[PDB]
Amino acid sequence: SVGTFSLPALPYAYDALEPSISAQIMELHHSKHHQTYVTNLNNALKTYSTALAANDVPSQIALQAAIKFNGGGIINHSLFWENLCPASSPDADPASAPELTAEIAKTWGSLDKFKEAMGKALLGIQGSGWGWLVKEGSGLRIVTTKDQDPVVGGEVPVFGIDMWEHAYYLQYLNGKAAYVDNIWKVINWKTAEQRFKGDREDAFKILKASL
Amino acid sequence: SVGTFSLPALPYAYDALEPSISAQIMELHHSKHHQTYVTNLNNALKTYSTALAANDVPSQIALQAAIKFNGGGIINHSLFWENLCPASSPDADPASAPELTAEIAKTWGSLDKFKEAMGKALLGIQGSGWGWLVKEGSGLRIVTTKDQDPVVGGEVPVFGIDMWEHAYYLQYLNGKAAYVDNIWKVINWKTAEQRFKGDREDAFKILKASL
Amino acid sequence: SVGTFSLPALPYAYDALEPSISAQIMELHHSKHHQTYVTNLNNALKTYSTALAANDVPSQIALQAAIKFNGGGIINHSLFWENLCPASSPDADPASAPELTAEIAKTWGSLDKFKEAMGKALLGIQGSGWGWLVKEGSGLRIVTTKDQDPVVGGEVPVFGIDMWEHAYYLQYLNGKAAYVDNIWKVINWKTAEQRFKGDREDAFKILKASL
Amino acid sequence: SVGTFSLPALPYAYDALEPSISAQIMELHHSKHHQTYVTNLNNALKTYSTALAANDVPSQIALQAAIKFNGGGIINHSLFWENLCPASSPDADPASAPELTAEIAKTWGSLDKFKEAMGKALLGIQGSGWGWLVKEGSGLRIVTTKDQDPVVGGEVPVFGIDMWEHAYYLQYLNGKAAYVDNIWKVINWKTAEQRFKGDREDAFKILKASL
Numbered sequence: 001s002v003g004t005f006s007l008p009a010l011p012y013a014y015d016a017l018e019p020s021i022s023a024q025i026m027e028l029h030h031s032k033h034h035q036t037y038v039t040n041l042n043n044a045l046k047t048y049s050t051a052l053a054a055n056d057v058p059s060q061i062a063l064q065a066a067i068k069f070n071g072g073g074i075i076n077h078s079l080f081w082e083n084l085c086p087a088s089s090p091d092a093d094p095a096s097a098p099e100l101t102a103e104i105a106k107t108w109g110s111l112d113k114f115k116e117a118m119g120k121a122l123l124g125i126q127g128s129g130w131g132w133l134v135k136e137g138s139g140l141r142i143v144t145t146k147d148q149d150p151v152v153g154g155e156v157p158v159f160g161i162d163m164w165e166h167a168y169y170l171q172y173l174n175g176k177a178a179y180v181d182n183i184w185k186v187i188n189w190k191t192a193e194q195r196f197k198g199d200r201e202d203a204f205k206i207l208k209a210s211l
Numbered sequence: 212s213v214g215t216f217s218l219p220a221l222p223y224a225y226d227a228l229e230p231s232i233s234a235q236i237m238e239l240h241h242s243k244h245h246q247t248y249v250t251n252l253n254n255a256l257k258t259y260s261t262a263l264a265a266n267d268v269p270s271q272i273a274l275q276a277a278i279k280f281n282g283g284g285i286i287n288h289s290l291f292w293e294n295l296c297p298a299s300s301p302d303a304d305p306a307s308a309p310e311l312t313a314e315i316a317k318t319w320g321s322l323d324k325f326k327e328a329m330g331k332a333l334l335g336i337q338g339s340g341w342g343w344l345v346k347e348g349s350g351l352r353i354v355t356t357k358d359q360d361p362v363v364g365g366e367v368p369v370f371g372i373d374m375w376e377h378a379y380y381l382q383y384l385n386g387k388a389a390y391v392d393n394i395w396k397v398i399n400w401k402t403a404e405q406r407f408k409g410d411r412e413d414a415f416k417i418l419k420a421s422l
Numbered sequence: 423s424v425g426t427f428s429l430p431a432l433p434y435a436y437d438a439l440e441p442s443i444s445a446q447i448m449e450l451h452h453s454k455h456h457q458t459y460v461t462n463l464n465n466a467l468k469t470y471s472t473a474l475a476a477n478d479v480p481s482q483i484a485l486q487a488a489i490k491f492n493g494g495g496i497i498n499h500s501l502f503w504e505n506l507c508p509a510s511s512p513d514a515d516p517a518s519a520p521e522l523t524a525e526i527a528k529t530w531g532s533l534d535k536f537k538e539a540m541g542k543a544l545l546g547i548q549g550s551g552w553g554w555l556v557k558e559g560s561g562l563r564i565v566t567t568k569d570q571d572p573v574v575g576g577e578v579p580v581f582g583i584d585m586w587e588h589a590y591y592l593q594y595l596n597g598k599a600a601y602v603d604n605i606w607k608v609i610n611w612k613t614a615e616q617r618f619k620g621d622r623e624d625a626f627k628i629l630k631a632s633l
Numbered sequence: 634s635v636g637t638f639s640l641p642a643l644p645y646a647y648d649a650l651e652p653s654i655s656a657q658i659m660e661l662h663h664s665k666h667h668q669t670y671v672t673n674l675n676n677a678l679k680t681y682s683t684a685l686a687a688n689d690v691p692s693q694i695a696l697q698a699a700i701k702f703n704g705g706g707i708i709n710h711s712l713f714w715e716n717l718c719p720a721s722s723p724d725a726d727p728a729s730a731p732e733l734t735a736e737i738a739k740t741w742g743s744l745d746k747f748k749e750a751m752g753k754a755l756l757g758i759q760g761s762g763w764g765w766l767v768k769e770g771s772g773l774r775i776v777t778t779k780d781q782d783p784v785v786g787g788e789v790p791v792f793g794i795d796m797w798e799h800a801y802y803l804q805y806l807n808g809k810a811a812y813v814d815n816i817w818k819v820i821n822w823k824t825a826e827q828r829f830k831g832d833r834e835d836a837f838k839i840l841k842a843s844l
């Protein structure tokens with residue numbers, strides 16, 4: 001039935017990504033922000049179902065902002081949690097992603113040059129938004145999205161990094177560069193490799209965990 | 212059932228607004244452009260229903276552009292045809308709208324100053340879009356919208372003027388100023404008065420004619 | 423010469439707005455965020471000077487986002503600091519704004535009902551942005567802007583409230599409703615009255631303090 | 634000096650692209666639309682120079698829409714005329730672009746599949762806009778822009794196709810699919826090859842013809 005999303009459990013404990021991301025941020029980010037996207041998405045979807053059945057197009061259009069924002073919220077965060085992992089896990093080793101890192105090096109020259117390019121895009125975001133490594137056709141691209149806009153246009157998301165201030169401010173204050181530098185330690189390259197090899201639908205299977 | 216919109220008949224013949232708007236434009240604008248919005252809206256709505264029932268949020272967000280564009284298309288054109296009428300009709304006489312014209316004069320000083328102000332907004336639109344007289348709270352405002360974006364945010368639409376090039380180009384070429392000057396002759400002030408007296412829901416009842 | 427903006431001093435100490443806004447936030451918000459908008463604006467403006475002299479239109483257009491973002495940043499924050507004051511100051515008393523509060527009560531019914539309307543708009547902002555009371559013509563309107571977009575389209579800014587997460591997160595966490603509730607306590611109604619009685623250029627004279 | 638742009642002559646007579654594009658459209662498109670962008674750009678730039686020298690940021694931001702719209706107008710149309718040519722010219726033969734067509738086949742599989750992809754993108758534009766083949770890094774990409782937004786973000790424009798209704802409506806009416814089918818005959822693949830082989834600066838040197 002429509003609008004039965006729930007907050008999925010994290011793949012790890014709230015303090016599992018320290019020192020890169022504090023337990024305080026993880027708990028707030030998950031239990032509060034992600035939770036709010038779930039609740040407000042469900043409310044919008046139930047309202048939309050009525051308007052859709054009634055062929056009430058004005059109400060449907062007026063509901064789009066709530067669905068894109070909160071729906072994008074659960075999409076982006078579902079992907080986000082899955083492509084993070086504890087620094088001690090083997091999945092944080094980029095050796096877990098031989099084909100992806102091979103294509104990264106082909107495209108940007110090296111993994112370090114890619115990290116530099118990605119960092120620049122993340123720090124260049126004006127306001128709230130996300131940075132993404134995506135697969136487009138066979139090639140890789142760095143893209144950013146504003147607010148909670150998701151990567152649903154056709155590309156395969158490989159991994160994303162949240163640049164909303166609530167993702168880092170309590171720990172890094174205005175130092176978003178330090179946040180980005182440290183998040184590399186907790187990137188889940190096993191997840192990234194799997195998405196790189198799969199297609200768009202494969203990548204979004206994770207959303208089933210929220211239903 | 213979902214997606215059963217049809218093209219409503221015009222309140223007048225295709226040549227009824229000459230010389231202000233040619234019969235060629237009216238026929239193309241109605242039988243082709245408005246028709247296409249109807250057909251593509253219905254298809255998008257049915258596809259959305261599938262995604263909504265499946266809680267497929269990525270597909271829903273990807274469909275929003277088609278629903279807003281084609282849904283706004285049928286909304287704006289339904290309102291547009293209704294607030295046009297033959298120049299010889301009494302409804303084109305602004306005396307048909309005593310309360311609205313009184314509020315216009317209170318707001319812009321006179322009807323002539325409003326029309327001049329409105330023209331400036333219409334001619335200032337970059338690309339495709341619409342100009343609207345709307346009621347917000349108790350006051351009147353001139354607003355513009357891009358492409359087929361409709362006035363569904365809460366304001367009451369009073370009347371709109373289509374500034375897409377297909378609304379005038381065959382007859383006026385690049386002379387959109389002449390188009391605007393001549394469309395005043397075929398504005399349906401009876402409709403404008405009715406919407407001014409009603410609320411938001413009242414104004415959109417015209418959409419029932421497309422179902 | 424082009425691009426000689428500097429960070430203006432606050433009208434009060436960093437801890438002067440406590441308990442509504444913490445000294446930590448004020449210092450970070452002013453010395454870091456506002457400072458960065460100043461620095462990046464000056465550099466963008468100088469780069470623009472090069473492009474204008476060269477009639478390099480591609481470069482000019484590519485620079486617009488940096489000028490709007492950082493230029494809006496210094497505009498919005500200059501206005502922001504000026505329309506805040508200590509809760510103990512007489513200027514925080516809305517009695518300091520007889521004409522404005524009369525028009526507010528005229529417009530929304532009462533000051534409390536206006537505060538309710540404003541709060542809803544502020545809390546409805548998706549992502550980063552600002553809420554503004556503005557004077558348009560003779561009437562008052564609540565408007566929101568995204569990111570650092572400023573109110574430069576013609577309205578007279580009366581007062582603004584920053585809803586970027588860096589404006590409240592350290593103190594209120596995700597509780598933006600509590601932030602809004604408490605910021606009313608430090609609104610400078612003397613400033614608001616002055617802007618309300620003046621025109622657009624009058625309101626932006628404050629920018630001279632940054633030159 | 635600032636704001637001394639002029640309308641460059643076409644590389645051919647107004648009727649040289651028939652039957653693909655009528656002489657009536659070419660004359661209106663060039664002598665009227667492109668001319669207006671030139672005039673309104675010059676006026677915006679002269680006003681901007683004053684605001685820039687005065688560090689008047691509000692005025693600079695308020696002028697951005699006019700500079701982007703009219704500046705993009707002259708950029709896009711300058712490139713547009715240059716990448717069109719008579720259907721009988723050898724430059725209209727894709728054999729004139731061996732390196733480009735080779736990369737196209739690598740990217741989309743074949744020239745026909747690229748044309749199919751481009752056509753879909755062009756016909757999918759909502760409202761006014763442009764479709765572009767661009768070079769990003771070493772790869773080719775199809776992108777669309779709204780209104781007169783130009784491709785100034787870093788990519789090298791290879792060729793563009795105007796999808797504003799004034800580019801085809803007088804001749805094709807609502808039949809934009811027929812317009813796209815026929816414009817392939819007058820694409821200047823010699824020009825496209827040169828841009829593909831050059832860098833971004835190389836591509837925009839054509840603007841010098843407007844000074």
Ligand SMILES: [Fe+3]
Pocket residue numbers: 029033077162164166167
């Ligand atoms: Fe987040």
Ligand SMILES: [Fe+3]
Pocket residue numbers: 240244373375377378
């Ligand atoms: Fe239309």
Ligand SMILES: [Fe+3]
Pocket residue numbers: 451455584586588589
């Ligand atoms: Fe701020």
Ligand SMILES: [Fe+3]
Pocket residue numbers: 662666795797799800
């Ligand atoms: Fe054009």
